[PDB]
């Protein structure tokens, strides 16, 4: 869900 | 000393002003609310009532009586707070996740006691209501999923729920495709005055959170179902300008103590003075030179967070501070890498720490309310409208960044998402419905619900983008940010001309149009208001929508007096003709003309009401649903596929990839089958022996005779791709199959073949529902879709192979929009089954190892490859190829490096292939002995 980068 | 009484989170941070509404309408005692989600911790300390004697269900016996009344023979009482639990998806093999549903439920109705380990008590919006907890999860398809939560809705209504929160959804799905049972459940809830609140979704726009959609393609909404149902209240996520946050403290050069927000994964030691060191973006080991024993301070960018965190641990860091590379960004929850403490901070705070002298930082144990780096700003992840059918969603916005609530195993955590926004609005809706039972007692429940939704949307505050100097688009924020104080105080609301909703849909517009709204006054005295409309569109950066608003102009303030207990219409003329040239230069297929009609008691006072309007300057229903074929791209690129600039015609196939994240574009697929595998299936080899494999490739692509591991597009003189099949059952270029990158949803996708003489010779089975390719990610959807129903094997209606010639492979599909014309994309496909006529005799020259053929090959389609293979055993079986010399002969070698192994004459095979895949293979021995 959250940005990985 | 009496027992310690802790403050609640809302006592310190209440961005939506829930306390004002609670002062008017209570905290939920005697009321029941329902949460439909994926799983719950039913034993959480947050599930408690202050006075169970006021509850609707005082015991398991009261609940079973209600069940018997409605014929419900499943589900159970749990405790005084959780009056009902049922799992509607028990046939699922996967384990139950309890985090997300517990978190949502805590926002709606958590009621943690002062005995909690937390510094501040979680007290949800309706902390004294009882909960019905309903588990639903996908098990056997999306239709069955909808049938299951339709039953949960109906059970919730019949067990007395006043509001139902659904913090889940599936992106881009159309309302019309829901089962009738599901549509009837929504209507049943509305007929009983039961509110249903849905999350907008966390899918940003078409392309996802790492991309911007293309300015040529304005229908970039990704809101799905259940949110797309008109009767629900769909909630987007934004960040307020302040938030209760954990903090860290640093001594600066000219401000002594300086507190900054941190968002931590795992735990730093509170009140411990850590040292830190700058480590660039954490990409090289040299970055972590002075990091041993300290906190690595790392800038966002280039590599993944988990990579930066692991690299810091490798160099002996005790923790990680990662600061944003965006200005006014949002806190991002960092991944847990082997328990490593890691905190995210803003760019301003990161740059401050970088240039700070005393590089020592201390984490504080008590959270406090600090300004947010983002200021008031809509969440980047929040799903944009419009719905598949083109209706206006979301409806409203609520805080959804880093919300602290209950999770599994009696714990608490912060989470971001529209799933956190929705239960806050659900709680506000429930309390406003309670207020209206006293304020409007002669209405029915359904009339009170309809009023509450209109007041919530009207009284919501249109959020303003300070950087762009315009209001955030209604397709992103709906009717504004919810405000429980304004909503509780409201005696007026505003709707469209037909009194159906607090939003105005204008469908297609020209540059001149009118916005008509009705102002409803429910008070005993006449009221005078000033109104004005904003006129705005999308901001555009180069070829992309910026996902930001562009102000065009605002109308002049006008006046209206609404008599008591009555309503009046007003009409605002809009004329954007002077902008059309510049806007059409940016958005050539049309653009939205949208805004808000804003109402005030006096032009210098604060906004009292606001209603959004949306129109499309163009023909929205007939926007192209399909991205043009990759073959028609000048630079070789597409939305999800970047080309090799030094080779724009290169187009490699699937290869040995496991996932299909590469090559997502519109094209035709086929298969390449080497001659060795064709032979092994003629002879009957069980499990294949050879070094070559069958590969899925794109039609119209061909390797070079001097193999280099790449395929390339070939085209006719006119420019179309050279697509050709040889339907002879050998698996080499036998078929074509449609692969599509859909920019919009579509229905009734079907492939047909035309003989270019005026007849349809074949028609595929129909694919009824097509969903837009709104991302290119395994966690959501891939950037293109392969449609197996469109596979054409070269046969006709009756089942006979069609004759040699060129045909039209036609793919038809229709957009979801009402009255949309059918669209289609055509491919020229050659059929040719003519076997190559190769030479049957050959003489060999022992002097120079040159093999002379008796005749040159004869093929119907142009020659693809003339080669001589040789298979040798290398460390147990490789196969390489030889190209013909310029005089026609082939030079055969005597060995082959691996070591070095000799080559017998029995190892060579003459292989001839045409551009349709027709192939002949003959051992060179049979050529010599003949
Ligand atoms: Ca074939
Ligand atoms: Na509003």
Numbering used by the authors:
A (entry chain B): 83 to 87
B (entry chain A): 94 to 781, 785 to 972, 974 to 995, 999 to 1030
Sentences from the paper on this structure:
The Streptococcal C5a peptidase (ScpA) specifically inactivates the human complement factor hC5a, a potent anaphylatoxin recently identified as a therapeutic target for treatment of COVID-19 infections. The emerging view of ScpA and related subtilases is that selection of their substrates is a dynamic two-step process involving flexibility in the domains around the active site and in the C-ter of the substrate. Surface plasmon resonance (SPR) analyses of the ScpA-hC5a interaction have shown that high affinity binding of the substrate is driven by electrostatic interactions between an exosite on the Fn2 domain of the enzyme and the bulky N-ter cleavage product (PN, ’core’ residues 1-67) of C5a. ScpA, a C5a inactivating protease, represents a novel enzymatic approach to therapy.
